[PDB]
Amino acid sequence: DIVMTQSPASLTVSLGQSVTISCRASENVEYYGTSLMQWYQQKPGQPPKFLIYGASNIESGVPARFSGSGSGTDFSLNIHPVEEDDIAMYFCQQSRKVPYTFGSGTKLEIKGSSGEVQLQESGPGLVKPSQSLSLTCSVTGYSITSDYYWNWIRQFPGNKLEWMAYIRYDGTSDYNPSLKNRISITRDTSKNQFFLKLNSVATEDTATYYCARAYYYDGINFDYWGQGTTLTVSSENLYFQ
Amino acid sequence: LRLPLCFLGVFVCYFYYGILQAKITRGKYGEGAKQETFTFALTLVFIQCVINAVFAKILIQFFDTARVDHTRSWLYAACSISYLGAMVSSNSALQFVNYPTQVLGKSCKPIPVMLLGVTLLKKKYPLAKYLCVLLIVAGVALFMYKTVGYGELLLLLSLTLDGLTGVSQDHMRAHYQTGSNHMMLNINLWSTLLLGMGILFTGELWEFLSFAERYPAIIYNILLFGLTSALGQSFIFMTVVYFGPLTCSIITTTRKFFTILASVILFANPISPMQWVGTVLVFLGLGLDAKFG
Ligand SMILES: Nc1ncnc2c1ncn2[C@@H]1O[C@H](COP(=O)(O)OP(=O)(O)O)[C@@H](O)[C@H]1O
């Protein structure tokens, strides 16, 4: 699959400076003269927020500071008037191959130190290995039978994202090929929920699982995200938190 | 791995498709007062669209089953209306002008899109583009000359709708990554639905059946025409599968010249030499755009 590499892991910036973040894809993500690239901004302990799709197509409501650039395999994101709000992690995502992949993420730091959809994840917190698991994402304020993709994504410790799967409002579902034989995504329209079932979860599955609503345009854009549920797989019990 | 099979396939499918189209449209029917010319352009386009839809469904079922079509349904209808209208205008034009005029008009695809981009959207174009249209216009003007007749207006409408279909397809491909087979199947399905509605509403489906009853031999030719039309696109896609688009552009460019050449000289028209030079000049105009890509 396509591997995204973000050369600057950590950027030290002073307010007012212009910052550029680079992201290189293994394969040309150009498709019919259109770049299938997206950018997301993640604050500590928060779901990512969608910023840009393709090349410099700023999402409505995002400040004019952000601007995408580049084409082919190399892309960049520029924030000219950096401000306090922009201090976060930034992820570059490609939507050219059916496994959607995110970059390792670039973290910024400063020296000197009802008109929406409500997603709610739920599931067991601590689980023993080899047990089957089922997470439920309930949707309120919207009907999952309307035109929007509903995806399950996960984030491992270290802030590495991995798109698990998704289901469309038509019922069409697409899986990550690496996990097509370990997970299953289903939906229940009567209660307005969709479930992700994992078979024989191993220790490597410890992560934060998000359910997101996305719309396809110049790729796939995970515009809305849930709060996210933490899942810890271990052979021993944990308490107090 | 030699790849003459795809080139052959295309040149043997679309060539015979043109031959059957010429036979169906301009084919002499009856004698004396029985000159019932083929005025049922809707039914043949409907048959062609349904055949294309079924073949595209087969191709999808056999190739890239894992792909998921992201295009919105209403996008397909918007392109399909112009697609169907372009076919109806072009095929209807055969009722008034000879086959060479229609094929040359089909080769005039760049002018609508080029005109739109240059004058309507205010986008500058290279020198080569600004001269391709001039060469083609000179060639066609020489060819044409020896209110206006219906054939010319029908051809103009066909060109306009072809340009609209092209721009809509470009937009949907860019912003939805729609596959070749999926687009073919969906636009053919929408076109056949609309054509069925119209044809049954206008009633000439009954009249077309009466015409078939008078001349039963038509049905064997219309079916073959639709089959060749579908197979042409099927083999065009196969070229991409066997080898990347670099071959697709070459095959399209060479076809755009071979088809017109065959329909002009190989069809054995009663063309006067004063007119053939115009075809020669438009040839000198055609392809020259592909010289610069
Ligand atoms: N990668 C590509 N690069 C350039 N052109 C392409 C590419 N993929 C598809 N096309 C275009 O898509 C078109 C599909 O042809 P098609 O419409 O089936 O032929 P017809 O118009 O005879 O039915 C081709 O003419 C080809 O130029």
Among B68, B176, B177, whose Cβ lies nearest the Cβ of A174? B68
User: Which of A27, A30, A34 best probes binding to B when mutated, by most B CB atoms within 10 angstroms?
Assistant: A34
Asked if A97 has any chain B CB less than 8 Å from its own CB, the reply is no
CA distance B64 to chain A (A): 12
For residue A97, report the distance from its CA to the centre of ligand 1, in Å.
21
CB contact under 8 A, B176 and A98: no
Alpha carbon of residue A31 to chain centroid? 22
Q: Which atom of ligand 1 is nearest to the CA of B236?
A: 18
* Rounded distance between C-alpha atoms, residue B269 and residue B266, angstroms: 8
Q: Find the DSSP H helices in B69-144.
A: 73-93, 99-107, 110-115, 127-144
Select from B147, B136, B141, B234 the least CA-distant residue to B185: B234
Select from B117, B164, B126 the least CA-distant residue to B293: B126
Asked if A159 has any chain B CB less than 8 Å from its own CB, the reply is no
Q: In what order do the strands lie in the sheet with A66-69?
A: A4-5, A19-25, A74-79, A66-69
Shortest CA distance from A171: residue in chain B: B68
Asked if A98 has any chain B CB less than 8 Å from its own CB, the reply is yes
Contact status, residue A234 vs residue A203, Cβ threshold 8 Å:
yes
CB contact under 8 A, B175 and A218: yes
Shortest CA distance from B73: residue in chain A: A147
Alpha carbon of residue B227 to chain centroid? 15
* Rounded distance between C-alpha atoms, residue B10 and residue B212, angstroms: 30
- Exposure string (b/e) for A104-135, b if CB count within 10 Å is 16 or more? bbbbbeeeeeeeebebebebeeebeeeeebeb
Q: Is the dihedral of CA B198, B202, B203, B209 positive or negative?
A: negative
* Rounded distance between C-alpha atoms, residue A18 and residue A140, angstroms: 40
- Residue owning tokens 């999808």: B60
Asked if A172 has any chain B CB less than 8 Å from its own CB, the reply is yes
Q: Which two tokens stand for residue A225?
A: 């995200």
* Rounded distance between C-alpha atoms, residue A159 and residue A106, angstroms: 10
CB contact under 8 A, A34 and B66: no
Select from B278, B289, B233, B253 the least CA-distant residue to B101: B278
Contacts of B245 in chain A (CB under 8 A): none
Reported structure resolution in angstroms: 3.2
Asked if A170 has any chain B CB less than 8 Å from its own CB, the reply is no
Alpha carbon of residue B94 to chain centroid? 13
Domains of chain A: 4-110 (2.60.40.10), 118-230 (2.60.40.10)
- Contacts for B104 with CB less than 8 Å, ≥ 6 apart: B140, B143, B260, B279, B282
SS3 content of chain A, % helix, strand, coil (to 5): 5, 50, 45
Contacts of A174 in chain B (CB under 8 A): 68
CB contact under 8 A, B70 and A216: yes
For residue A37, report the distance from its CA to the centre of ligand 1, in Å.
25
The strand pairing partners of A167, in sequence order, are A150, A173
For residue B185, report the distance from its CA to the centre of ligand 1, in Å.
14
Among B66, B67, B175, whose Cβ lies nearest the Cβ of A217? B175
Contacts of A147 in chain B (CB under 8 A): 72
What technique solved it?
cryo-EM
* Rounded distance between C-alpha atoms, residue B165 and residue B158, angstroms: 10
For residue B272, report the distance from its CA to the centre of ligand 1, in Å.
34
Select from B93, B89, B163 the least CA-distant residue to B121: B163
CB contact under 8 A, A32 and B66: no
59-98 of B, contacting A, C-beta below 8 A:
66-68, 70, 72
Select from A67, A65, A63 the least CA-distant residue to A75: A67
CA distance B166 to chain A (A): 14
| Ramachandran sector of residue A60 (left: φ over 0; alpha: ψ -120 to 50; beta: rest) | beta
* Rounded distance between C-alpha atoms, residue B236 and residue B233, angstroms: 5
Contacts of A172 in chain B (CB under 8 A): 68
For residue B86, report the distance from its CA to the centre of ligand 1, in Å.
17
Contacts of A33 in chain B (CB under 8 A): 174
* Rounded distance between C-alpha atoms, residue A66 and residue A69, angstroms: 10
* Rounded distance between C-alpha atoms, residue B111 and residue B108, angstroms: 6
Query: In chain A, how long is the greatest CA-to-CA distance?
Result: 54
Residues with CB under 6 A from ligand 1: B 180, 233, 236, 245, 248-249, 252
DSSP SS3 for A232: strand
How many residue pairs from chains A and B have C-beta atoms closer than 8 A? 22
User: Which of A35, A71, A216 best probes binding to B when mutated, by most B CB atoms within 10 angstroms?
Assistant: A216
Select from A26, A42, A14 the least CA-distant residue to A158: A42
Q: Which atom of ligand 1 is nearest to the CA of B237?
A: 18
Asked if A165 has any chain B CB less than 8 Å from its own CB, the reply is no
Q: Within 13 Å and on the Cβ side, how many CA atoms surround B114? A: 17
Residue B111: Cβ within 10 Å count: 16
